[PDB]
Write a protein that binds this ligand. Structure first.
Ligand SMILES: Nc1nc2c(ncn2[C@@H]2O[C@H](COP(=O)(O)OP(=O)(O)O)[C@@H](O)[C@H]2O)c(=O)[nH]1
Length: 367
């Protein structure tokens, strides 16, 4: 039901501890797009009452996920795929608080894997690990359960070596990933299943059941018994931070202004009562709506009709319509508080990376 989901989005956007702003990153062909598309589909966000390629270069897609009796609003924000480095990559890392690092079970950790882990960690983005294509270990390589667990262990050790080496000093140990606490999951994005220790504890489901169904070709039972979106989004909710948790340590890194100032404090503490500061992540031109700027609200509350400064472009402006994402769709909202990803009209002169603020402040980017 559409009206129900819209109400749910409004409910959760008002509670910053229920939000997760994330991205997904991977070496080429390891499964970023398949995971992205199938999480969105599995969470039921593109059902007719409300798949391949829908997330490709999508500014944001949101998913509502229930975890231990509470609903969460997960924003899967665009991160550039298949590129080594660039301003676009850095900018997208700065927009997300958590990242799912996807590693192919066959190739393992590859040079581009190391690059994306580095790039995320450099901006205080907390990682979790999803080991993909486990169907290939089962069917094509015909590995034993012990051989597969040993393969996972090696991947995990390689990832943690990168975290130890590249995480900000304070998080070199804290952000290591482990199978035991479910900050690692493994599965097949393509066949819509995954497992983790917390999921297996909760349900009693065992890897051998998944192996059996896989070899039998019972793909319907497979994806229902160990759903990709349940296992992976459970991991997102438990282990990736809310914007209010993340901004307390991310904002001094991200913004070069005076953290002790009122606006600095409002961003540090994700305060919806402070002056509004947002950063534009992406702009598209819609034939009907005109320029639509997607962005993250760091502080304050963004409103339809709100007068703002475009800091990099050096102009005063007025936001026309504010929107928020429901799956891939923009839905109108007249006011949206800090912590959220929004889409706004009225800022045609803005560029990607633009700092948009109620007061003249230091920009997040030199632009
Ligand atoms: N066997 C298998 N193939 C997969 C899986 N996930 C993705 N693929 C395939 O691997 C290729 C690359 O996937 P894609 O999601 O586009 O990778 P990306 O480049 O990281 O975005 C495509 O042919 C996918 O269908 C998986 O779990 N198992």
């Amino acid at each position: 039901r559409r009206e129900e989901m819209i109400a749910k989005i409004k409910e959760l956007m008002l509670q910053p501890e229920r939000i997760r702003n994330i991205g997904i990153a991977a070496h080429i062909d390891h499964g970023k797009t398949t995971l992205s598309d199938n999480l969105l589909a599995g969470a039921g966000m593109i059902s007719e009452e409300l798949a391949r390629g829908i997330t490709i270069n999508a500014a944001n897609v949101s998913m509502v996920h229930n975890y231990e009796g509470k609903d969460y609003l997960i924003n899967l924000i665009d991160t550039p795929g298949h590129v080594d480095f660039g301003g676009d990559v850095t900018r997208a890392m700065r927009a997300i608080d958590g990242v799912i690092i996807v590693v192919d079970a066959v190739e393992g950790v590859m040079p581009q894997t190391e690059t994306v882990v580095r790039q995320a960690l450099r901006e205080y983005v907390k990682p979790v690990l999803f080991i993909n294509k486990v169907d290939r270990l089962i069917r094509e390589l015909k590995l034993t359960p012990q051989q597969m667990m040993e393969r996972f262990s090696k991947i995990i050790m390689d990832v943690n070596r990168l975290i130890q080496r590249y995480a900000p000093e304070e998080y070199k140990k804290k952000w290591m990933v482990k199978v035991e606490d479910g900050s690692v999951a493994f599965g097949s994005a393509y066949y819509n299943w995954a497992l983790s220790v917390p999921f297996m504890k909760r349900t009693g489901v065992k890897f051998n059941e998944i192996i059996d169904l896989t070899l039998k070709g019972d793909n319907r039972t497979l994806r229902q018994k160990a759903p990709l979106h349940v296992v992976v989004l459970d991991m997102v909710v438990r282990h990736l931070p809310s914007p209010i948790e993340a901004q307390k340590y991310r904002i001094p890194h991200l913004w070069e202004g005076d953290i002790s100032s009122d606006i600095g404090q409002a961003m540090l503490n994700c305060d919806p009562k402070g002056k509004m500061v947002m950063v534009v992540t992406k702009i598209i031109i819609d034939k009907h709506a005109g320029e639509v700027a997607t962005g993250r609200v760091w502080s304050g509350t963004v409103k339809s009709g709100q007068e703002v400064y475009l800091i990099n472009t050096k102009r005063k402006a007025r936001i026309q319509q504010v929107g928020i994402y429901m799956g891939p769709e923009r839905i109108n909202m007249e006011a949206v508080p800090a912590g959220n990803i929004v889409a706004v009209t009225g800022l045609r002169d803005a560029m990607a990376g633009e700092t948009v603020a109620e007061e003249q402040i230091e920009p997040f980017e030199a632009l």
